[PDB]
């Protein structure tokens, strides 16, 4: 019982789920867990705080507003590796006198001044990569070839320059952001261990090829327990949600009452945004359909004037935000149109569900590519080369193809063999769970 570990996730809910979620894990296997969150986020959530997994706050230097009162991403990337390492340090500080003082930082590898902190205090460090092997592995050949990638990857030759991550095909975009997952290897070759939330199985060439470089613990998927090895009862969903929805057993009672296979479930994550026109195209290409649509609150005034409406009642739903882990397990669910965000992914690849992959940006177009012509488990909508943008007829096109054709029966077929592999990787003996002690091990 010795052990005790600080998890300090990327502020947004798609780092914060992973996080919590393997925090779940270390706790079932004795391990006590601390996850800081920045107090913008702490005090948007009001999280519930009874629970296996306690919360510290740090500081990203935004208290007040959070990121959308930043300046630029330069600036709060910057504010934040200030502001979050002298609080980082706090915590540790804080916690020195107790009955279990912080012994270990999982941190981000999207900050990696993280790890520094940790070796002042002596504390064991590992990063958590959020993101796949194969994206990992891309972005540190870039960071070894001085942030440039010659097409072909002599060890992916398959991939494409529409299939590498946005800051490689949309020249300058987000520098920021482009030089921070770039220096996600500026010193993890310097960790106690390197983590990963993906599963062997999944990436067996590129787990192999990344590992060669440096070892990596695969530790996921980082899915709820009670959809596959269900060996932590107690661990029934994601419970840390920076949205909030309108207590929808109101989505999963209208999903309850739709024929099998027959509804097509729409959403982008917690943060891509789509234009005016992406929104017109799409609207129109779903409008074929019965579809269950997530648009963000924020994202609304990019309908179509009087869309929401016109959706009729009986086939169809807009919603702010769903309960995405209880749709994606709803039988009246004949395929996902998603944004290829690595988390929604791994969700669709483990419940089995066919996707429609429409990537935006930063690592989506890589997990667009592996969806299609790796796993096999969808199609990549195709987006018109000079104006960027997914029309309605090639939409709903990709929407057909995986939902009626003969591609579709083969896609379902290959989509299900991944919900055993993850069980079993999970399970007493699997790859997962077998890194998982691994670490464990050493942090206590
Ligand atoms: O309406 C929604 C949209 C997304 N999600 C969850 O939000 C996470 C989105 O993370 P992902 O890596 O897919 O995308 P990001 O939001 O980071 O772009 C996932 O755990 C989804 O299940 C949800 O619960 N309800
Ligand atoms: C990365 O930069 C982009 C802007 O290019 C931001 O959208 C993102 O900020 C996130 O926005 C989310 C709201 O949709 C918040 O949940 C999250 O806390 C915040 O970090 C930047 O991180
Ligand atoms: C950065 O750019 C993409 C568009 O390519 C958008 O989806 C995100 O919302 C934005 O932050
Ligand atoms: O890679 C991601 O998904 C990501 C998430 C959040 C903020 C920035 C990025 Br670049």
């Known amino acids: 019982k010795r052990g005790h570990v600080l998890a300090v996730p990327y502020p947004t809910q798609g780092h914060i789920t992973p996080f919590r979620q393997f925090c779940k894990r270390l706790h079932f296997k004795g391990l006590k867990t601390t996850l800081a969150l920045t107090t913008f986020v702490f005090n948007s959530i009001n999280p519930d705080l009874s629970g296996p997994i306690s919360i510290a706050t740090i500081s990203d230097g935004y208290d007040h507003g959070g990121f959308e009162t930043a300046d630029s991403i330069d600036d709060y990337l910057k504010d934040f590796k200030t502001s979050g390492s002298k609080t980082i340090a706090d915590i540790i500080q804080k916690h020195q006198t107790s009955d279990n003082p912080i012994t270990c930082i999982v941190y981000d590898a999207f900050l990696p001044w993280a790890l520094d902190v940790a070796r002042e205090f002596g504390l064991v460090a590992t990063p958590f990569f959020t993101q796949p092997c194969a994206v990992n592995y891309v972005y540190y ?139 017109e195209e799409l609207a129109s290409a779903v409008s074929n359909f019965s579809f269950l649509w997530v648009v963000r609150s924020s994202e609304e005034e990019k309908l ?57 940006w930063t690592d989506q177009p890589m997990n667009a590519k592996y969806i299609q012509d790796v796993w096999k488990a969808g199609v990549r909508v195709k987006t018109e080369k000079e104006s960027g943008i997914a029309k309605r007829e090639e939409i709903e096109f990709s929407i057909k193809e995986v939902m009626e054709g003969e591609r579709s029966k083969e896609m379902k077929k290959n989509v299900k063999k991944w919900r055993d592999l993850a069980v079993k990787s999970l399970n007493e003996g699997g790859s997962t769970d077998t ?5 464990v091990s050493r942090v206590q």
């Not at 987000?174 to 939330?197: G, S, T």
């Not at 009862?233 to 920076?242: A, E, H, I, M």
């Not at 929808?248 to 479930?265: A, E, H, K, M």
Request: aromatic share 12%.
């Open 141 to 279: 050949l870039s960071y070894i070839n001085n942030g440039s990638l010659q097409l072909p990857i002599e060890e992916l030759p398959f991939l494409e320059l529409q299939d590498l991550p946005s800051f490689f095909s949309v020249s300058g975009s987000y520098p920021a952001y482009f030089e921070m997952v770039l220096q996600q290897f500026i010193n993890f070759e310097k960790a106690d261990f390197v983590l990963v939330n993906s599963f062997q199985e999944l990436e067996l060439h590129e787990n192999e090829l990344w590992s060669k470089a440096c070892p990596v613990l695969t530790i996921g998927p980082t899915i709820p327990s009670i959809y596959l090895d269900q060996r932590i009862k107690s661990d029934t969903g994601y419970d840390l949600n920076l949205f909030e929805s309108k207590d929808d057993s109101f989505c999963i009672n209208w999903l309850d009452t739709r024929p099998q296979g027959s509804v097509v479930y729409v959403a982008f994550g917690s943060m891509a945004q789509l234009t005016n026109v992406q929104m």
């Open 304 to 360: 179509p004037s009087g869309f929401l409406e016109t959706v009729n009642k009986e086939k169809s739903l807009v919603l702010k935000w769903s309960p995405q882990l209880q749709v994606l397990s709803n039988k009246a669910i004949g395929c996902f149109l998603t944004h290829c965000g690595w988390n929604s992914t791994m969700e669709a690849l483990t419940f089995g569900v066919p996707m429609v992959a429409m990537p935006q």
């Open 435 to 439: 890194n998982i002690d691994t670490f």
